[PDB]
């Protein structure tokens, strides 16, 4: 939203594999895994709307609190024709293989960099969608019991 300050947060939360439909299935199947994770933010605005948004990610972070992303893996998004920016998170754990359901993937934060601008015939706020998938180096290892029941 245009109202959101040039530093306020538009979205913040701790990311887990289970937060993703496709992945959550593997989470309930395999016990461990490894590889990079890719998140793709798709902001659906009009051809008139313009602005920037920086989304960072602190690997294995647990404290759900807004924090400067200058040192975090971030991606600045400048609205244009291709309004679907991505961000990759290289495998990061103390082990060669990590729990598919255990420690968080990290802190995901999308802060406002430049207020969403608009005009008389354009929206003052737009909708955004965050998707997630595994990298080309993704792997899963041990199959374990189930933690949930699908339908």
């Amino acid at each position: 939203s245009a109202t959101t300050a040039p530093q306020s947060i538009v979205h913040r939360n701790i990311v887990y594999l289970r937060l993703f439909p496709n992945l959550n299935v593997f989470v309930n199947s395999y016990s461990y895994f490894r590889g990079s994770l890719v998140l793709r933010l798709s902001v659906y605005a009009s051809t008139f709307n313009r602005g920037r948004l920086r989304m960072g990610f602190f690997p294995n972070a647990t404290t759900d609190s807004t924090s400067t992303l200058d040192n975090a893996i971030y991606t600045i998004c400048d609205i244009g024709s291709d309004n679907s920016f991505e961000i990759t998170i290289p495998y990061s754990f103390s082990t060669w293989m990590r729990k598919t359901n255990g420690h968080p993937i990290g802190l995901f934060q999308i802060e406002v960099l430049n207020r969403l601008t608009y005009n008389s015939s354009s929206p003052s706020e737009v909708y955004c969608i965050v998707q997630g998938k595994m990298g080309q180096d993704a792997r899963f290892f041990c199959p374990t019991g189930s933690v949930v029941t699908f339908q």
Partner: protein, 192 residues
Amino acid sequence: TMSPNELGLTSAQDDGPLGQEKPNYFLNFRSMNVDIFTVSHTKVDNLFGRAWFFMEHTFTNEGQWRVPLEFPKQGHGSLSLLFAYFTGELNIHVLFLSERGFLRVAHTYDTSNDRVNFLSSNGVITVPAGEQMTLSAPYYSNKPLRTVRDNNSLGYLMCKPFLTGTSTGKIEVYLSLRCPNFFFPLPAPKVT
């Protein structure tokens, strides 16, 4: 060199056809594939090659046990729910918990409940009391593909125990598949 497309800047409406193994990079990073085991545990043949519990039946008489075999929404086999169609060998693991007797086991994709009344040629393997067998039922289906979801996606299993005295018991059944052919992956399932 690297294009801006491979650096994160893309368009969601230009993803078709389905299945684009596009590489993603940035300075100080590149897709690194490191293996821990001598083989993959993600391959359909390997993963599903491992059984999983299905259901249990407690018998008292010599009656027959007819049950619509289906894919699990419970164990690691749930990964099948990501697909729409299946076809291939089916491994059925049966445990005959009985003091003294025999267990007739058979399998068919035929929906008719009368072609089973006899068990003539439906695969009547014999597991002696207190024993257990693993029979691999072929794709004797009348349908080229098995919708993976159907309450009878997998063919029906038959169990007519041949008891001798007042002896009774229970038949626990678990199963896996041999080389599975899955097609047209559908959206991920929901949770209960």
